[PDB]
């Protein structure tokens, strides 16, 4: 029972990276209904913005 073969790191790593990036808060590249726009690019027009 080789440990490195057992636990797939990419599962949680890219699983969070997907949500945060795209914004479809759910698993994963097969998302719907998933809630899009949960994560979005921070407005940097003005400081108040």
């Amino acid at each position: 029972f080789n440990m490195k073969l057992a636990i797939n790191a990419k599962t949680i790593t890219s699983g969070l990276k997907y949500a945060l990036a795209t914004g479809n808060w759910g698993e994963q590249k097969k998302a719907m209904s998933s809630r899009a726009g949960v994560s979005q690019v921070l407005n940097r027009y003005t400081y108040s913005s």
């Binding site: 073969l5 479809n24 719907m32």
Partner: protein, 299 residues
């Protein structure tokens, strides 16, 4: 295209994309009027639309190099769906389905690269090396978990991703002599500097030590001081020389442990290099603590 009026051999023509025309740059004759935006047209195949609202999104991109041309959708749940018909139409796809299932050996390569911390360009070379040699009569009956373990070092040896064969022996599995012969029948169809970053990091040495070890090891080879010792040993030895020269030292036991070499062997290379320690170091190396060239162990 070539202008029908002029005809000069290097046919100088411009694509005035903005006016949607293709012009002959010499006479000015328009050679074509229908002109399409390839960027936006490609946006219809590979988009950001995963929901399904885009009316522009109407196709999908495929990879004819890796999976040939296998167009195939998947029966899945939609908005208004009974969980019954999904099962039946999927249980019906089971009777229509061997080699169209050996593509799950790509899932073996993908799960091995991600367990070996390997880039996206390496997987796609390992998957192309495996697709073009898994049904060969030249490989015949080699250990099927050692021919995909050999096609990962084939994909790494083109994508410039330093991975020793003993690094892939740790992943799976590998029988050494078995995946060493298989790494040659497919090939018909590392260096000192490679290890230095990782070994040093585990060692916990500074950039200064890494650079010097890296310089020494190269010089050792250039000098041909170590006739045929394995590069891993050379590197571990060089790391020993440089580190001992600097403040934060590391012992043979500790270097060997990281390099996965034995102290005796590191000793072997080290003593061979030591005689030309002076030539080996970077010129602006600063020996510190109390370790100058004269004082280095010499062991």
């Amino acid at each position: 295209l070539t202008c029908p009026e002029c005809k000069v051999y290097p046919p100088k023509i411009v694509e005035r994309f903005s006016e949607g025309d293709v012009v002959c740059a010499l006479c000015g004759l328009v050679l074509s009027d229908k002109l399409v935006d390839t960027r936006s047209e490609w946006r219809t195949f590979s988009n950001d639309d995963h929901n399904g609202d885009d009316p522009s999104r109407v196709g999908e991109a495929s990879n004819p190099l890796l999976d040939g041309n296998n167009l195939s959708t998947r029966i899945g749940k939609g908005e208004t769906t009974d969980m019954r018909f999904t099962k039946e139409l999927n249980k019906a796809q089971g009777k229509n389905v061997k080699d169209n299932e050996v593509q799950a050996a790509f899932a073996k390569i993908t799960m091995l690269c991600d367990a070996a911390e390997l880039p996206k360009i390496v997987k796609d070379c390992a998957k192309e090396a495996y697709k073009l040699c898994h049904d060969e009569k030249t490989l015949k009956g080699k250990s099927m978990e050692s021919i995909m373990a050999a096609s990962i070092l084939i994909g790494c040896r083109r994508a410039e991703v330093a991975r020793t064969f003993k690094e892939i022996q740790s992943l799976i599995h590998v029988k050494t002599k078995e995946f060493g012969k298989t790494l040659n029948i497919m090939k018909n169809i590392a260096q000192n500097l490679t290890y230095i970053p990782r070994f040093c990091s585990h060692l916990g040495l500074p950039m200064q030590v890494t650079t010097s070890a890296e310089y020494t090891a190269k010089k050792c080879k250039e000098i041909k001081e170590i006739a045929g010792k394995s590069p891993i040993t050379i590197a571990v030895v060089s790391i020993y020389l440089n580190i001992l020269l600097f403040q934060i030292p590391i012992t043979a036991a500790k270097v060997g442990q990281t390099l996965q070499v034995t102290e005796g062997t590191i000793k072997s290379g080290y003593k061979i290099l030591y005689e030309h320690r002076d030539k080996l170091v970077d010129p602006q190396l600063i020996a510190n603590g109390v370790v100058s060239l004269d004082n280095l162990p010499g062991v």
